[PDB]
Amino acid sequence: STGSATTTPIDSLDDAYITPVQIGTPAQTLNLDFDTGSSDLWVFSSETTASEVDGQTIYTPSKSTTAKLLSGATWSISYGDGSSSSGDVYTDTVSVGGLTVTGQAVESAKKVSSSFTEDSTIDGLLGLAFSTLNTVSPTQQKTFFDNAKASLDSPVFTADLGYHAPGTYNFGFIDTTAYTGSITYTAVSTKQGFWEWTSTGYAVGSGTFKSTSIDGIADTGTTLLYLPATVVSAYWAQVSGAKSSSSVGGYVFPCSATLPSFTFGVGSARIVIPGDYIDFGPISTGSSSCFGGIQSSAGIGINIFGDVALKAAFVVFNGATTPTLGFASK
Catalytic position from the list 33, 35, 123, 219: 35
Do 22 and 152 reside in the same domain of the chain? Answer: yes
* C-alpha closest to that of 131 among 325, 327, 323, 326: 323
- Is the preceding omega at residue 26 within 30 degrees of 0, hence cis? yes
Indicate the Cα dihedral angle 273, 276, 278, 282, nearest 10°.
-170
Can you spell out the DSSP letters for 81-113?
TS-EEEEEEEEEEEEETTEEEEEEEEEEEEEE-
Do 170 and 185 reside in the same domain of the chain? Answer: no
Q: Domain boundary at 119, 143, 174, which?
A: 174
**Contact indicator for 264, 327 with CB cutoff of 8 Å:** no
Domain housing 66:
5-174
H helix intervals, 55-182 = 114-118, 144-148
Q: What is the three-class DSSP state of 137?
A: strand
Q: Which residues contact 114 (CB under 8 A, 6 or more apart)?
A: none
Method: X-ray
How many Cα neighbours within 13 Å face the side chain of 84?
9
Distance between CA atoms of 240 and 236, rounded to whole angstroms? 8
- Is the preceding omega at residue 138 within 30 degrees of 0, hence cis? yes
Do 138 and 183 reside in the same domain of the chain? Answer: no
Do 52 and 25 reside in the same domain of the chain? Answer: yes
Give Cα separations from 85 to 34, 198, 245, 314 (angstroms).
Answer: 16, 31, 30, 30
- Give φ, ψ of 27 to 5 degrees: -60, 140
Distance between CA atoms of 26 and 69, rounded to whole angstroms? 17
Q: Per the structure, how many domains does the chain have?
A: 2
Do 122 and 221 reside in the same domain of the chain? Answer: no
Do 129 and 10 reside in the same domain of the chain? Answer: yes
Give Cα separations from 29 to 18, 23, 124, 184 (angstroms).
Answer: 12, 6, 11, 35
Do 152 and 181 reside in the same domain of the chain? Answer: no
Do 130 and 224 reside in the same domain of the chain? Answer: no
Q: Which residues is 303 bridged to in the sheet?
A: 216
- In the annotation, is 35 catalytic? yes
Distance between CA atoms of 287 and 303, rounded to whole angstroms? 29
Q: Domain boundary at 174, 199, 222, which?
A: 174
Distance between CA atoms of 110 and 96, rounded to whole angstroms? 24
Do 94 and 213 reside in the same domain of the chain? Answer: no
- Give φ, ψ of 16 to 5 degrees: -155, 175
Distance between CA atoms of 142 and 36, rounded to whole angstroms? 14
Distance between CA atoms of 157 and 165, rounded to whole angstroms? 20
4 burial via Cβ count (<10 Å: 0-12, 13-18, 19+): middle
* C-alpha closest to that of 40 among 139, 116, 134: 134
Do 132 and 267 reside in the same domain of the chain? Answer: no
**Contact indicator for 221, 260 with CB cutoff of 8 Å:** no
Distance between CA atoms of 68 and 318, rounded to whole angstroms? 31
Catalytic position from the list 199, 261, 296, 297: 199
Q: What angle do CA 325, 157, 272 make, to 5 degrees?
A: 50
Q: Which residues is 88 bridged to in the sheet?
A: 74, 108
Q: Residue 309: give its domain's CATH number.
A: 2.40.70.10
**Other beta carbons within 10 Å of 81:** 11
- In the annotation, is 199 catalytic? yes
**What is the sign of the dihedral through the CA atoms of 14, 94, 136 and 44?**
positive
- The single-letter DSSP state of residue 278 is G
Do 57 and 118 reside in the same domain of the chain? Answer: yes
Do 202 and 312 reside in the same domain of the chain? Answer: yes
**Contact indicator for 83, 89 with CB cutoff of 8 Å:** no
Q: Domain boundary at 123, 152, 174, which?
A: 174
Distance between CA atoms of 220 and 309, rounded to whole angstroms? 9
